[PDB]
Amino acid sequence: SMLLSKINSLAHLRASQYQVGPLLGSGGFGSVYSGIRVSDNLPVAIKHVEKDRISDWGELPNGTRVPMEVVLLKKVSSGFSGVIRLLDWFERPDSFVLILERPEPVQDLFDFITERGALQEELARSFFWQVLEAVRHCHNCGVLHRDIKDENILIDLNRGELKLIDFGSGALLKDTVYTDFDGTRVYSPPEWIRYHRYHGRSAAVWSLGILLYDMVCGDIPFEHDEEIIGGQVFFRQRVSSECQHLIRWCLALRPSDRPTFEEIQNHPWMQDVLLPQETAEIHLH
Numbered sequence: 615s616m617l618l619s620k621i622n623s624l625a626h627l628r629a630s631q632y633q634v635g636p637l638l639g640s641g642g643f644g645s646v647y648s649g650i651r652v653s654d655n656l657p658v659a660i661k662h663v664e665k666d667r668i669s670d671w672g673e674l675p676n677g678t679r680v681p682m683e684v685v686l687l688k689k690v691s692s693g694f695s696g697v698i699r700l701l702d703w704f705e706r707p708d709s710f711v712l713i714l715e716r717p718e719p720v721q722d723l724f725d726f727i728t729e730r731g732a733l734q735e736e737l738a739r740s741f742f743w744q745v746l747e748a749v750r751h752c753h754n755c756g757v758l759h760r761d762i763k764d765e766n767i768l769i770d771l772n773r774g775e776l777k778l779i780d781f782g783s784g785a786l787l788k789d790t791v792y793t794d795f796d797g798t799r800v801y802s803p804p805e806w807i808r809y810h811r812y813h814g815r816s817a818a819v820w821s822l823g824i825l826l827y828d829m830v831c832g833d834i835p836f837e838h839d840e841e842i843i844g845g846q847v848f849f850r851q852r853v854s855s856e857c858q859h860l861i862r863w864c865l866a867l868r869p870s871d872r873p874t875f876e877e878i879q880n881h882p883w884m885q886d887v888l889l890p891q892e893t894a895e896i897h898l899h
Contacts, residue, residue: 617649617660620706630702632713634660649713651701657716658701663782665708669796670785681710686781689755696748698768698777714779719771723764723829732832732851735883740893741767742826743884744776749818750875752778758787758814761797762821764828774894787814800834804843804867816869819878823864830857835865843867856883 617632618624631652638646638659649658663681670682680703687700702713723741727733733741745767752759759766761783768777783796791811795802803820805812827835831851836842845867849858860883866872878884888896 617711619704632658632660638716646714649716651713656701657718659698659714659716661712661714663710663712665710672786680705681782682784682786683781684710684712686757686784686786687712687714689757690752690781692755695751696744696776696778697751698779715777717768717770717773717775717777720768721771723767723769723776726769727764727828727832733829734897735830735854735857736888737893737897738826738829738857739884739886740774740888740890740897741776741829742822743879743887744890745778745825746822746875746879748776748778749822753787753815753818756787757781758785758818760784760795760814760817761801762818762825763801764825769898771898772894774888774890774892774898785814789813792817799839800837800842802839802842803869804845805869807839807842813869815875816872819864819872819875820869822878823861826857826864827861830861854883856881859883 615634617634633650633652635648638648640646645662647660649660650656651658663683668681671679672682672685674680674685674688684700684703690697691699698715700712700714704711745762749759749762759778759781761780762778766778766780768779770777785792791813793810795806795812801821801824803812803817806817824834827847830853831849835847847862847865860878860881863873864878873881
């Protein structure tokens with residue numbers, strides 16, 4: 615179908631280009647469709663955002679009123695990185711339309727883990743390193759993602775490159791305390807469960823601990839609030855002592871006890887990371 619200005623642009627005798635196909639393959643209910651930029655046949659993802667469901671608005675360099683999601687995407691879509699770039703957007707009477715990159719072939723990290731189970735530590739190290747670099751990029755651009763998880767990471771299977779998606783829960787980065795959070799219970803950091811307060815960078819490091827465990831174990835470590843605040847990590851799979859050490863450090867109960875990004879990337883487990891193309895050749899081809 616032709617992407618037109620409005621859903622009802624053809625409703626009357628009175629009358630880049632994008633072609634739109636079906637919903638992108640999903641067991642969920644996201645409003646993301648397969649697309650093509652007609653000029654150059656570039657694959658895109660076409661995401662719709664319903665105005666009456668936007669809880670967080672902001673302003674562009676323009677000084678123009680858009681979903682916070684558009685503000686954040688524009689900030690991180692500068693240059694090249696492990697973030698899915700916003701290529702274009704426009705406003706409709708009752709929604710916004712976002713045109714995003716679409717690598718081909720692609721699989722999200724959740725489906726990858728379903729299919730392949732617990733990842734080898736060399737693969738987990740390449741993947742985790744790439745997510746750390748992508749999150750640092752977001753922070754340097756003044757953006758806090760607030761929902762880092764396997765479901766929000768795309769794998770570009772040919773290049774071995776990871777890409778963050780879905781800034782729908784994110785915020786402008788600040789160094790002061792946050793009192794709002796939109797994530798699910800099994801991904802809450804302990805300081806949110808106990809106090810409804812967190813700092814952005816230290817809550818991100820929590821989410822990264824959950825993700826590293828997820829990669830090397832094949833599922834997240836906690837189901838219940840009492841597990842999140844209890845301070846015990848059980849390993850169900852074989853994991854190296856140095857990988858266990860880094861996970862337990864990221865999942866410190868007290869935010870101040872969590873490593874900085876420098877301390878994570880200088881950790882013994884994080885030495886000798888593969889290049890993305892190496893990763894694809896050994897693990898994904």
